[PDB]
Design a protein around this ligand. Structure first.
Ligand SMILES: Nc1ncnc2c1ncn2[C@@H]1O[C@H](COP(=O)(O)OP(=O)(O)NP(=O)(O)O)[C@@H](O)[C@H]1O
Ligand SMILES: [Mg+2]
Lengths: 98, 775, 64, 260, 144
């Protein structure tokens, strides 16, 4: 596990943010298990949205630690008014619209 | 003689240039070849092609039309300065001085109401900049107006704002005569330059043998007149990419709707070219065989014929045989509807992989991807093209992205310039300490920052560097929760244990007690500096006094390194250039720091890096005018209604937009013509994508009007096999629905993995789509 | 390609790029030596080409 | 239903690329050194007029731009003259003797490489025709097909014979003996400037063959001149300058290799 | 209070149109937009025909603004097709064609409108204020 995380760190340094998370989800089969688990679809959608936001925030931030610092800061004070931070639709299927 | 070369494609013009260069050789070897281009990518492509053909391309100058015409001014007429006195940069600072002296005038009464409430000359500077831009545009496109304004008369039948614009320009000229600067500017110089060569018995010395104008499809009428006057002595070869074979400028609406709508930029240009008296033109076109949908549309555009059927007659509206058969397997033109830009790029990657697999001859360099705004799609493009596996890896290079060489140093310096206005929040100062250069300057290690975070937090530092800063904001002096308070507290805690008690109504901070407290001594060294400068930058200073400010601040606050030296040099160069323009304009009055800071902020990010346009990998870049290069695969992203075309409305008091003439340029028409250039340049495949439904709200978006007209023309000009019995409208809707592809919202949707042409290439989401995982 | 002006060495219209390049290459000196065309002649040639295109379109529409 | 993703039969190729010599490779003595000082020293000659004596005010303004000490201004001017008046290869050309018509500064060239350029298949020829390459270990780089870029410092013609001049501001040593012929050759071998000037000569030969009607290599070419700014001293004519002429056979075989 | 007929509604000065829910208030906007573009109604018509860029529409929400822009685009397209074909399957377009004098010039104007629909002046109150401040910063006295 330490070795795979060290390789993930190398991928993170080289190819950016999204490649590391993608390789992690592929190797750990996170998406498959979440889709299998009841309700995990919303979880996977939120994870993907968080990954996209982390990529957008790491593009501007050159330091690797700065992205973690920014993520912790945003977790401390979530901005509800932000349109980007709005939660996306759960599924494209038929949903009761409240 | 001025020879105009017409060709539907660029490669023909380029080969003609090749043959002309090879046939007639330059006598002197060191004489540089002249090729006019308005874009760097066009020049780079020309160089790469000429080197590939001849064996090497060198000593080929690529100046802009304006700079070239100014160079010709310098050589043909004597007593002309190297650089024009009237430029966009200097007129701003000159009008900044001239406007306060003219507020007493009645004609400027409205301007008075504008300049009444300004405190730090913000409105004055912005108005001067806008007026300088307007005057430059007038110089370029409207010399008669300036010629009339200099004498003091008014132009009949013009805009209302002329009343306040005509005298100012006059008051400018006289002003630049008092300082002693050269009177000559291009507007008055045009007629004399034309007359000197018109009556010249022989060719003047120093002129180049021949000139080339390649890739420029838009020129002002005055430049064309100057080139016509210059064509007598020296030959000029204009390579003009013409989308239509026949005469399509002011046809004696154009015949083709897709050309009439998007051809406003080229109609005026071809009408000007036709109006040249001493021009000899030969047509070198290439016919296109209508074997594909894209080739069919290109042939319709080239032949200036209309293929869509309106259906006015009942017999015409009933049968669908009037349209052209469309092959179902054909995929030359394909429209794609996605949900998010991430999904859009992820689908574009798979489509590019499919196109590469389908055709062995295709190469990544041939493919090009153009987006409305490259900065909005840069993270998604980069992540999608980086996450691809090694066997699936596609090389990419992104062009026209904002030039960001060292962002933290730039932002730290910009924030340091705002010192007098800053409240010195603890988080803000820690953000300045984030930069490793500013910390190395005060030998603050990265491990020490973990300690200084909790120290600042627990000690109680909230805002304010000292009590004087608190009193300066007209707030009651408290004496606590300031940087001085926290520093004194930490020092007392290093000196005296907190168990003893208060000494000066300040509880010592026990945490900083050992050798680590030396960090405090370094931190207290920073703030003191932050104090000194925050007092030095308050007072307004003349321009010559602002010269050593930037260098002193950099060498005081920053300790350079191998990487940061470049950014520091760029900052110094921009600062020195701004102050040099100011001093050349002889601005006497004092200038506040808030003006130079906000000017440097605008000047630093205006840079762009397009050096990797044709590096070899697939090209990612925005749509830039005057850059038309043929490519096999041409993809277009971000075509949502409102994003493209990009709308930049005029200032509102410009006189050109009131009574427009032929040759006037507008960003709207520029984008409308770039969309046509993208269509014509596509040789094999055209890909167009746009966001249909918002991923967040599941709402409905719309595509650009251009894509709408394109799909309308397609649906009205073609019919699928087996739909002959159907009427025009049903067959049109069927074709439009067959070509428009609606992709899924999520990558793990199993529809993506069903066998077909829409089948994806990413196997990572295959087990998820198959629903084979365990809970 | 328009029928009018086919004999003129200036015109290089062809079916492929290579044919156009050869057509231009063979008659380069002839093109250069020819004097410049008058404005009236250029307008006349453009009008003739437009009329030819119009007549072609009319004949096609009659064929429908 | 059954789901299967597609596979790629043909792998896309990254062979096509555009690279430079850097990509393939991968008192004045006490003057500060670095990337920025070197670029400043080069920009000085970029806009310097050789046919006129140096002006103290211009040097002072350039030192203000660079940010160096004004104390260098009295000396640097003299040093610049030492560069302008220093003699050259046996023709005895002085830099001040070059007029604005017989000079070309910072010429950018593009050279196509059609077949993939292998280090092994080139190093053998370079070692065969150049002893400096024989002294060094074999070239090592990956296959490259595409374009080659480069910026030539100066090209000038004298007596109807052309030359190539390349400025170098590397601090070879602290003493003048470190700027001798053997030491300069050792530095060339260490920084692999041999391949650099070879490619420069290939580019120049192709450009002259293209431009000059009835061109001949032996007749019109004059050799290669590396100018070490700090090495230039009025006392010793040899220290600071280096002159080398590539073999015509090497140039011809290199041209044929790069063509096909 | 009088019943409303979109074709006979005079467009001069201020006019108030009040009705209950689901009565087609938003739907009449398209008919009035077409009338303004074509300049129909005789006495009740505007004195001169107008362009897309001169008609202002103010909506409450952004989504409704986009919906109205799309629907106006679609109505312009359908009316242009009807004018080209001189026949239509909708009663409103049928009455319009009955009111139109010359259909070729009307179709040309509708084509120009379709081509300028990208610049349609349909905004919200806050967006209208922002755009008027930006376009006229000189008169309003704000920054550029
Ligand atoms: N004259 C008409 N002919 C046909 N359908 C109509 C007509 N007027 C309105 N409709 C339809 O009526 C429905 C609602 O119309 P709408 O314009 O939203 O009314 P409304 O006054 O805006 N309701 P509200 O927005 O809640 O105040 C839509 O489906 C329209 O197509
Ligand atoms: Mg409504």
């Amino acid at each position: 596990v330490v070795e795979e995380f060290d390789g993930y760190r190398q991928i993170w340094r080289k190819r950016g943010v999204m490649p590391m998370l993608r390789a992690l989800m592929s190797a750990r089969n996170i998406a498959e298990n979440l889709l299998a688990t009841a309700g995990g679809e919303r979880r996977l959608t939120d994870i993907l949205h968080i990954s996209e936001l982390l990529q957008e925030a790491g593009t501007q931030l050159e330091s690797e630690h700065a992205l973690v610092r920014w993520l912790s800061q945003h977790i401390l004070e979530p901005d509800s008014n932000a349109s980007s931070q709005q939660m996306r639709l759960e599924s494209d299927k038929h949903l009761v619209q409240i | 003689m001025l020879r105009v070369y017409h060709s539907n494609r660029l490669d023909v013009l380029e080969a003609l240039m090749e043959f002309i260069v090879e046939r007639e050789r330059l006598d002197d070897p060191f004489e540089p070849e002249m090729i006019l281009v308005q874009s760097t990518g066009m020049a780079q492509w020309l160089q790469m092609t000429l080197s590939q053909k001849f064996g090497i391309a060198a000593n080929i100058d690529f100046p802009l039309p304006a700079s070239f015409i100014w160079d010709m001014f310098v050589r043909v007429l004597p007593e002309i300065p190297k650089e024009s006195a009237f430029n966009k940069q200097s007129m701003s600072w000159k009008l900044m001085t001239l406007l306060p002296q003219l507020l007493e005038r009645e004609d400027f009464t409205l301007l008075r109401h504008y300049l009444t409430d300004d405190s730090d000359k913000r409105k004055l500077f912005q108005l001067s900049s806008k007026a300088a831009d307007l005057f430059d545009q007038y110089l370029v496109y409207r010399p008669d107006w300036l010629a009339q304004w200099e004498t003091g008369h008014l132009v009949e039948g013009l805009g209302e704002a002329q009343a306040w614009q005509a005298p100012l320009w006059k008051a400018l000229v006289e002003y630049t005569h008092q300082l002693g600067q050269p009177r000559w500017h291009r507007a008055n110089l045009y007629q004399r330059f034309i007359e000197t060569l018109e009556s010249a018995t022989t060719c003047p010395p120093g002129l180049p043998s021949r000139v080339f104008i390649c890739g420029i499809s838009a020129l002002p009428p005055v430049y064309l007149q100057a080139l016509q006057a210059l064509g007598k002595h020296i030959e000029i070869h204009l390579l003009f990419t013409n989308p239509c074979r026949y005469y399509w400028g002011d046809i004696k609406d154009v015949g083709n709707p897709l050309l009439a709508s998007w051809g406003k930029l080229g109609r005026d240009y071809i009408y000007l070219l036709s109006d040249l008296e001493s021009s000899q033109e030969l047509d070198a076109f290439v016919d296109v065989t209508p074997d594909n949908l894209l080739h069919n549309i290109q042939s319709d555009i080239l032949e200036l014929e209309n293929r869509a059927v309106a259906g006015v007659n009942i017999e015409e509206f009933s049968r669908s045989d009037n349209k052209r058969p469309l092959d179902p397997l054909d995929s030359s033109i394909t429209f794609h509807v996605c949900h998010s830009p991430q999904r859009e790029v992820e689908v574009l990657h798979d489509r590019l992989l499919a196109m590469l697999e389908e055709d062995p001859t295709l190469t990544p360099r041939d493919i090009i991807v153009m987006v409305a705004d490259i900065d909005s799609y840069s993270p998604f493009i980069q992540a999608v093209f980086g996450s691809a596996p090694a066997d699936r890896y596609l090389p990419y290079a992104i062009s026209d992205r904002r030039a960001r060489q060292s962002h933290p140093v730039l932002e730290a310096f910009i924030s340091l310039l705002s010192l007098p206005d800053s409240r010195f929040v603890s988080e803000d100062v820690l953000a300045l300490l984030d930069v490793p250069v500013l910390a190395a300057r005060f030998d603050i290690t990265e491990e020490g920052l973990r300690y200084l975070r909790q120290w600042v937090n627990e000690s109680g530092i909230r805002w304010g560097i000292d009590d004087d800063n608190v009193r300066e904001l007209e707030l009651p002096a408290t004496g606590q929760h300031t940087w001085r308070f926290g520093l004194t507290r930490m020092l007392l805690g290093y000196a005296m244990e907190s168990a003893q008690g208060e000494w000066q109504s300040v509880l010592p901070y026990d945490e900083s007690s050992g050798l680590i407290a030396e960090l405090v001594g370094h931190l207290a060294s920073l703030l003191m500096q932050l104090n000194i400068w925050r007092r030095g930058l308050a007072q307004e200073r003349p321009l010559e006094e602002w010269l050593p400010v930037c260098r002193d601040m950099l060498n005081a606050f920053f300790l350079p390194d191998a990487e940061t030296e470049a950014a520091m040099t760029l900052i110094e160069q921009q600062w020195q250039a701004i102050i040099a323009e100011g001093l050349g304009a002889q601005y006497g009055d004092a200038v506040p720091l808030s003006l130079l800071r906000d000017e440097l902020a605008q000047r630093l990010d205006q840079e762009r890096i397009s050096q990797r346009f044709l590096a070899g990998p697939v090209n990612i870049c925005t749509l830039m005018p005057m850059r038309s290069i043929p490519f096999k695969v041409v993809c277009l992203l971000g075509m949502n209604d409102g994003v493209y075309p990009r709308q930049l409305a005029p200032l509102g008091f410009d006189l050109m937009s009131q009574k427009p003439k032929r040759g006037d340029r507008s960003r709207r028409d520029d984008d409308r013509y770039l969309f046509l250039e993208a269509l014509i340049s596509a040789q094999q495949k055209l890909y167009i994508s746009y966001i249909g439904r918002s991923i967040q709200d599941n709402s409905e978006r719309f595509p650009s009007v251009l894509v709408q007209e394109l799909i309308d023309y397609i649906g009205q000009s073609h019919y699928l096999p087996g739909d002959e019995a159907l009427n025009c409208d049903e067959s049109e809707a069927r074709v439009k629905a067959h070509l428009t592809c609606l992709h899924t919202r999520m990558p793990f949707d199993p529809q993506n993995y069903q066998p077909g042409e829409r089948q994806s290439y990413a196997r990572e989401w295959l087990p998820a789509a198959s629903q084979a995982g365990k809970a | 390609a328009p029928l009018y002006g086919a004999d003129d060495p200036r015109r290089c219209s062809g079916n492929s790029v290579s044919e156009v390049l050869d057509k231009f290459r063979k008659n380069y000196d002839l093109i250069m030596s020819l004097p410049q065309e008058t404005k009236e002649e250029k307008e006349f040639r453009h009008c003739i080409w437009l009329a030819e295109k119009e007549e072609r379109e009319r004949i096609y529409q009659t064929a429908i | 239903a059954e789901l299967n993703a597609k596979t790629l039969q043909r792998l896309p190729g990254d062979n096509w690329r555009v690279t430079s010599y850097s990509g393939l490779q991968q008192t004045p003595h006490q003057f500060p050194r670095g990337a920025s000082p070197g670029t400043f020293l080069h920009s000085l000659f970029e806009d310097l007029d050789f046919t006129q004596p140096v002006d103290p005010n211009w040097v002072r303004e350039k030192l203000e731009l660079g940010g160096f000490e004004s104390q260098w201004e009295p000396v640097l001017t003299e040093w610049i003259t030492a560069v302008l008046q220093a003699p050259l290869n046996e023709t005895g050309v002085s830099l001040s003797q070059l007029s604005a018509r017989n000079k070309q500064v910072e010429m950018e060239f593009y050279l196509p490489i059609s077949e993939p350029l292998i280090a092994s298949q080139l190093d053998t020829l370079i070692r065969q025709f150049d002893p400096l390459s024989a002294g060094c270990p074999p070239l090592e780089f990956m296959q490259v097909r595409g374009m080659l870029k480069g910026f030539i410092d100066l090209v000038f013609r004298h007596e109807g014979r052309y030359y190539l001049l390349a400025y170098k501001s590397n601090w070879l040593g602290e003493d003048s003996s470190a700027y001798t012929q053997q030491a300069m050759a050792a530095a060339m071998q260490a920084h692999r400037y041999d391949l650099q000037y070879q490619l420069y000569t290939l580019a120049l030969h192709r450009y002259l063959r293209h431009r000059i009607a009835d061109y001949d290599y032996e007749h019109h070419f004059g050799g290669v001149i590396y100018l070490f700014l700090r090495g230039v001293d009025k006392e010793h004519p040899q220290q600071g300058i280096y002159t080398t002429r590539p073999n015509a056979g090497l140039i011809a075989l290199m041209d044929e290799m790069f063509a096909g | 209070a009088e019943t409303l007929d979109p074709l006979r509604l005079p467009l001069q000065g201020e006019r108030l149109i009040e009705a209950s829910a689901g009565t087609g208030k938003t739907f009449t906007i398209a008919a009035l937009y077409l009338r303004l573009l074509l300049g129909l109604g005789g006495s009740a018509a505007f004195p001169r025909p107008l362009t897309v860029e001169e008609l202002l529409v103010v909506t409450f929400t952004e989504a409704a603004t986009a919906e109205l822009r799309g629907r106006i685009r679609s109505n312009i397209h359908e009316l242009r097709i009807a004018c080209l074909r001189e026949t239509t399957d909708n009663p409103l377009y049928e009455r319009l064609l009955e009111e139109i004098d010359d259909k070729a010039q009307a179709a040309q104007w509708l084509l120009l409108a379709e081509r300028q629909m990208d610049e349609a002046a349909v905004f919200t109150i806050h967006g209208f204020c922002q755009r008027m401040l930006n376009l006229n910063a000189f008169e309003s006295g704000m920054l550029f």
